[PDB]
Amino acid sequence: RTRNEMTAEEKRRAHQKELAAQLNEEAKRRLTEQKGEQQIQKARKSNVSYKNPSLMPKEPHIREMKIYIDKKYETVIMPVFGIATPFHIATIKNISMSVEGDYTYLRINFYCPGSALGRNEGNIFPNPEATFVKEITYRASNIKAPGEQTVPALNLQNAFRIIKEVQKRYKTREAEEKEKEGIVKQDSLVINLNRSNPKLKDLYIRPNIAQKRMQGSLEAHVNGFRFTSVRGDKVDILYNNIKHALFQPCDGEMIIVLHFHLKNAIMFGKKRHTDVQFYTEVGEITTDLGKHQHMHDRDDLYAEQMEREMRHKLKTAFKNFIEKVEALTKEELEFEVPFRDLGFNGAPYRSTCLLQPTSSALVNATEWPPFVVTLDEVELIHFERVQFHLKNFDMVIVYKDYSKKVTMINAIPVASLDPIKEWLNSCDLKYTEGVQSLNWTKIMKTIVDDPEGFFEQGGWSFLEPEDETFNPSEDDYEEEEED
Amino acid sequence: ESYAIYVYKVLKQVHPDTGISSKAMSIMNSFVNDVFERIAGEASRLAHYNKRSTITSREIQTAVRLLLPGELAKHAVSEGTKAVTKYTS
Amino acid sequence: EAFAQNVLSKADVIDAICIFRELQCLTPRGRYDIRIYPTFLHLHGKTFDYKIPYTTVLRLFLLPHKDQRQMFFVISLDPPIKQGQTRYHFLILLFSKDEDISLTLNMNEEEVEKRFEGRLTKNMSGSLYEMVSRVMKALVNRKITVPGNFQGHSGAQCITCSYKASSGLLYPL
Amino acid sequence: TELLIRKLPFQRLVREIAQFKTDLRFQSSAVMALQEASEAYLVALFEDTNLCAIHAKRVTIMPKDIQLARRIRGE
Amino acid sequence: TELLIRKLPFQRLVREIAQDFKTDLRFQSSAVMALQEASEAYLVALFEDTNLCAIHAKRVTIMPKDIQLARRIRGE
Amino acid sequence: EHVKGYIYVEAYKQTHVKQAIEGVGNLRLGYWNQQMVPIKEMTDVLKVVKANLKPKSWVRLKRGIYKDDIAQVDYVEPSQNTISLKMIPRIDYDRIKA
Amino acid sequence: ALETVPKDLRHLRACLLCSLVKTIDQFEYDGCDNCDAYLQMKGNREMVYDCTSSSFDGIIAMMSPEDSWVSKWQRVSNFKPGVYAVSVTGRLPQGIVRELKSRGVAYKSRDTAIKT
Amino acid sequence: DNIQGITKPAIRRLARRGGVKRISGLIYEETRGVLKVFLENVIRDAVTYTEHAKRKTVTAMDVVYALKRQGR
Amino acid sequence: DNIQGITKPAIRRLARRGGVKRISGLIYEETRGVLKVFLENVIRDAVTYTEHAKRKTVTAMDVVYALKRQGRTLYGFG
Numbered sequence A: 001r002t003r004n005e006m007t008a009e010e011k012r013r014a015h016q017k018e019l020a021a022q023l024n025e026e027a028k029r030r031l032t033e034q035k036g037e038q039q040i041q042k043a044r045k046s047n048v049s050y051k052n053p054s055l056m057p058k059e060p061h062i063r064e065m066k067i068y069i070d071k072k073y074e075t076v077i078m079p080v081f082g083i084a085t086p087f088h089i090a091t092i093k094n095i096s097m098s099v100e101g102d103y104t105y106l107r108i109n110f111y112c113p114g115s116a117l118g119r120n121e122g123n124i125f126p127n128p129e130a131t132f133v134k135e136i137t138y139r140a141s142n143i144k145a146p147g148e149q150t151v152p153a154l155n156l157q158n159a160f161r162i163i164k165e166v167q168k169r170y171k172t173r174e175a176e177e178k179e180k181e182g183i184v185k186q187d188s189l190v191i192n193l194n195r196s197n198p199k200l201k202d203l204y205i206r207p208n209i210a211q212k213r214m215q216g217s218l219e220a221h222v223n224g225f226r227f228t229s230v231r232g233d234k235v236d237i238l239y240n241n242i243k244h245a246l247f248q249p250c251d252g253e254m255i256i257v258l259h260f261h262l263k264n265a266i267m268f269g270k271k272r273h274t275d276v277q278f279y280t281e282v283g284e285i286t287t288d289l290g291k292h293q294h295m296h297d298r299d300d301l302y303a304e305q306m307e308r309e310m311r312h313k314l315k316t317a318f319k320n321f322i323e324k325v326e327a328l329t330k331e332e333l334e335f336e337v338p339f340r341d342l343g344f345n346g347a348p349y350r351s352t353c354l355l356q357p358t359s360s361a362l363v364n365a366t367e368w369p370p371f372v373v374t375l376d377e378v379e380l381i382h383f384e385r386v387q388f389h390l391k392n393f394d395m396v397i398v399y400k401d402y403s404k405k406v407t408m409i410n411a412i413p414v415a416s417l418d419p420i421k422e423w424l425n426s427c428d429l430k431y432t433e434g435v436q437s438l439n440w441t442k443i444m445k446t447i448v449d450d451p452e453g454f455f456e457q458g459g460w461s462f463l464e465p466e467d468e469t470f471n472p473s474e475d476d477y478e479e480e481e482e483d
Numbered sequence B: 001e002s003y004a005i006y007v008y009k010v011l012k013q014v015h016p017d018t019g020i021s022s023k024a025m026s027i028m029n030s031f032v033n034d035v036f037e038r039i040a041g042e043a044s045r046l047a048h049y050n051k052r053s054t055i056t057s058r059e060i061q062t063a064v065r066l067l068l069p070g071e072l073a074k075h076a077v078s079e080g081t082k083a084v085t086k087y088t089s
Numbered sequence C: 001e002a003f004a005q006n007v008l009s010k011a012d013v014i015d016a017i018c019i020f021r022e023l024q025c026l027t028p029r030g031r032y033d034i035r036i037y038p039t040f041l042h043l044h045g046k047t048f049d050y051k052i053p054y055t056t057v058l059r060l061f062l063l064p065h066k067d068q069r070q071m072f073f074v075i076s077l078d079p080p081i082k083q084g085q086t087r088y089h090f091l092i093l094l095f096s097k098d099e100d101i102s103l104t105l106n107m108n109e110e111e112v113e114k115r116f117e118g119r120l121t122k123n124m125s126g127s128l129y130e131m132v133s134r135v136m137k138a139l140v141n142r143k144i145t146v147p148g149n150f151q152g153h154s155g156a157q158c159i160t161c162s163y164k165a166s167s168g169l170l171y172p173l
Numbered sequence D: 001t002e003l004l005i006r007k008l009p010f011q012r013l014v015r016e017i018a019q020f021k022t023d024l025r026f027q028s029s030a031v032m033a034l035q036e037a038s039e040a041y042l043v044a045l046f047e048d049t050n051l052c053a054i055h056a057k058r059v060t061i062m063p064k065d066i067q068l069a070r071r072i073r074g075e
Numbered sequence E: 001t002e003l004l005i006r007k008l009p010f011q012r013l014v015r016e017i018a019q020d021f022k023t024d025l026r027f028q029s030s031a032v033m034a035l036q037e038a039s040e041a042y043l044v045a046l047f048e049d050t051n052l053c054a055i056h057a058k059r060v061t062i063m064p065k066d067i068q069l070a071r072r073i074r075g076e
Numbered sequence F: 001e002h003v004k005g006y007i008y009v010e011a012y013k014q015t016h017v018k019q020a021i022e023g024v025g026n027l028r029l030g031y032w033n034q035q036m037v038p039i040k041e042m043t044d045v046l047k048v049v050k051a052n053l054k055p056k057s058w059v060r061l062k063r064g065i066y067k068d069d070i071a072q073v074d075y076v077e078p079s080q081n082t083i084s085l086k087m088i089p090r091i092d093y094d095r096i097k098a
Numbered sequence G: 001a002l003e004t005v006p007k008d009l010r011h012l013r014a015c016l017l018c019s020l021v022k023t024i025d026q027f028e029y030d031g032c033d034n035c036d037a038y039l040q041m042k043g044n045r046e047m048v049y050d051c052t053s054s055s056f057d058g059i060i061a062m063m064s065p066e067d068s069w070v071s072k073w074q075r076v077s078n079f080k081p082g083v084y085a086v087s088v089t090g091r092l093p094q095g096i097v098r099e100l101k102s103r104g105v106a107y108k109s110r111d112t113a114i115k116t
Numbered sequence H: 001d002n003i004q005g006i007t008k009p010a011i012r013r014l015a016r017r018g019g020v021k022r023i024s025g026l027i028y029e030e031t032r033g034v035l036k037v038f039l040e041n042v043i044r045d046a047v048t049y050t051e052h053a054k055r056k057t058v059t060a061m062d063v064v065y066a067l068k069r070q071g072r
Numbered sequence I: 001d002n003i004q005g006i007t008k009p010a011i012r013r014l015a016r017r018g019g020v021k022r023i024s025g026l027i028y029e030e031t032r033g034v035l036k037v038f039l040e041n042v043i044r045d046a047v048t049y050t051e052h053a054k055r056k057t058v059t060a061m062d063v064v065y066a067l068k069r070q071g072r073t074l075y076g077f078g
């Protein structure tokens, strides 16, 4: 009588058992082939203002005991009872200045254990048990001496400004050096000896080369793309370096985007980035309507027609550009169109967005920063917090490279559970379920410590899985009453 | 009292080779009582709307179609129709 | 303590009336200690510092929180303390009712009687917000404004409302 | 009383989506009651959206605001 | 499975609120268990809603304002 | 709106308006004389000849560079702050001015 | 009354049914006084911008419609005193004009001016 | 296709009536979909009530019953 | 009072099962208050039903009816 609905899920479970067997085998094989390998380690050294006293400056400010700042050497010399004590700009953590009408206070704070908060924590001092000068405050009268030249507080103000400038320059140079150390040098852009070269125009770039976005055009070269801003900022992206090419159309979006996930990081705008986007907007933003109102059958519907035409033209242009790049590269770089129907709401970086699974990468480009997960490197997936009284669950992507951090996607409507399972089943990915949230950090660390023992216990199969009953007894077999 | 005996009969009829737990039987009874109450409340609402003094098979069918989803409601309506036919037969 | 003793053994130390260490501030944000002086107050921070004369104070507001668990202590300033490209017109402090304290002034009994006219004592103890209110009152002479005869439907003394793209509490004083 | 949606387009949409059971008349009062209910419903939804936007600290409501409102509401 | 709220404190709170309502009352063990289950379910649902609000607010730390927004949008 | 110099009033006798326009300092000039118009001019004063704000119309300009030129209305702004306008450009494309 | 007299000359619109000339703030707060139940113009600027139109000319100090040739000619004898106009160029949508006749409100063209 | 005929200015008017100080470009399609869903639910309920009442014409009373059932 | 008996780890575990990764210090008092309001409403409804039935003790059936009235049916205890 019952509906009687069958379930291919059993076929899914069998396919998933096969995938789990293959996964265990391949994981064991790769870990046994690895068996530990070489590593890399660099050196470093603290900063020095002057290696010897002979390099000390000789300035009238120093002679008069005024807070001097040497820019070429990046040092700040301050008076300490007739002692011109120097400090490298790196020692100073920050500086502040206050005016109290009669006097001006200039405070200078250095780095020290406990105060090394932020991205400076890794800068472990060579001897944390020593005495660290944490604060030094100077006071200068604001009253101009009788017909003299400058005011004492003017010296403190000038010192504050110069120290801020030197600190800005020093931090800029340090950031540049730190981001250049570790870049994979890319080949030079083979200038287009070919006379054709497909090109596309009107494209805002992400991240921004300058402080704000830059409008520009793109040109497909023999071995890469060249992005040129309206001013002249040239950025190169070789084809061999492109790991994934995504094309997110404007069907239901405010921007038509071309996203490039690179295998190595390219440096531009004095910063290195792994993801790039070139988009064109087709949206509108207003207080509600146009702050006017009167829009009849001569601008409103006309505006809709214009918007549709612009969307269509941009879609056509993007498809033309894609086809030209493909034809020029001879299928060496293939673009991927994400399947919007197979998407689901997720929160990778804790921001509700619509992840879309292409055909070889789970992506999301409309929301910046981008999200990209290549399915070729996915070890497996785990659904945590999948119970009855929970309208949302989490997904955990474990990569083959155990030295990386697992990708955790929180808040996913339960209605989107079986679809994600079928998508993963088609992708040939093993998915398991878990009722509680596990400590993935400890799990991965333990697996890296004992991989063989891990497999001996069972490998990744660990994620997979008294009372009587009120039975119809003689007291239950009783009959009904009479009429 | 409860519908435990009837639930056990239906269970033996749909799967004559299986059992159940005490918590499972309790959950089934709670479900039976809740469905009964929902359908009865909807039927009372419809009867008060129609200004009738007797709940009828038509009222019950309307209540079922208002409560249960589409396919499930259609199957339940078919089962109830067959049952009432056999009863009146 | 050893360094302090070594310093005192050689120096000749001869001040602030009372020093509150680490008080939750909302505007500006962060933990700040407060040193009291006869004619101003020093708001010392981990980086930035300010000094507000009592002549710049306009009003002192002591307000409860909607949940009846915290207290807002607001100081209206004039001129507003400046910080680069921003000026603060109010100094807001947040306290907890269960946050007691025991303070001892850096003065003597007779001097306190002459200065505060008996409004304060050499040693005090009580709620932290109450202590701050009493001190600021005895210092500025301005009375601390308190909520009026308003009581919202939720029993709170304020209304939760938005303003300039930000949620907050509106108090009918 | 006040109606922002044009009654003719609204009626057209109702008869186009009421194809669950083809051929069914809708009284003028029935269409009016439906329009009033729809206007009130969208009004409440936008209020919740404004709350979500004010929470996110954005004066401009975005589709994710409405999505979150409906999710929390249980639609 | 297991209970997330401590049975004895929860039972004490239930008795306290019951005495506040009307003194000289008595509840059944199954009644207290059902109350605890309903309270845990309600709190979990509320926490899921608050987590959604925090996710939307582009944060990681849940806040009392998020709980308030969740309760508002729900309509309590 | 077309006339600019004198206004009209509706009354039975002249003494009514004479005593009603007493004290005002603006109409002090036209106070010693009250003219009466025939009964035939009781309907031509309300006549307006073709307000004058409709899209897809033709309008002239009195400022800018396109002086004494006709142009087409494209998009009205009831906000009362701006308005679009179709007019062929008359510039030189930047090749005459230094 | 003091609520119908225009406050500020700048930003002023006029209706098309009874031709009620007032200020935008008055239209937003109070709205149309001569026709409110059959218009719902009150409570929002949206219906104001939808029905009324700033394309109008003429200003007459209407004070006695019951006894006035201008009111008898303009057909505003059954309206309250106020400042009206003599021409208003515009037309209401089909959906807005059909309900008037359906409920029992005769829609007439107040644009007494001529064309060419 | 009348979901598009629902004049976007109408949606903007409905939204502008309170608090909504600024709207994005995608709110229109989202609001249209939400209105479509609500209308589908209400009309399904009303059609069920009408088929129960046997009448071939949906009535304001049936609409009110559907709204009360949904809990609006 | 016993409202504070609700242990901080218990609220943290409830939030974890929900899906919260980081909790704030002001959350525990608020959660306790919300739980107190919900329990008060449920007990109100239950005592109303008990007075209706003229029973001396609250029962699992009365609690289930109160939960239904609130809109959160609970099986198992029927």
Ligand SMILES: [Zn+2]
Residues within 6 Å of the ligand: G015, G016, G017, G018, G019, G020, G032, G034, G035
């Ligand atoms: Zn009018």
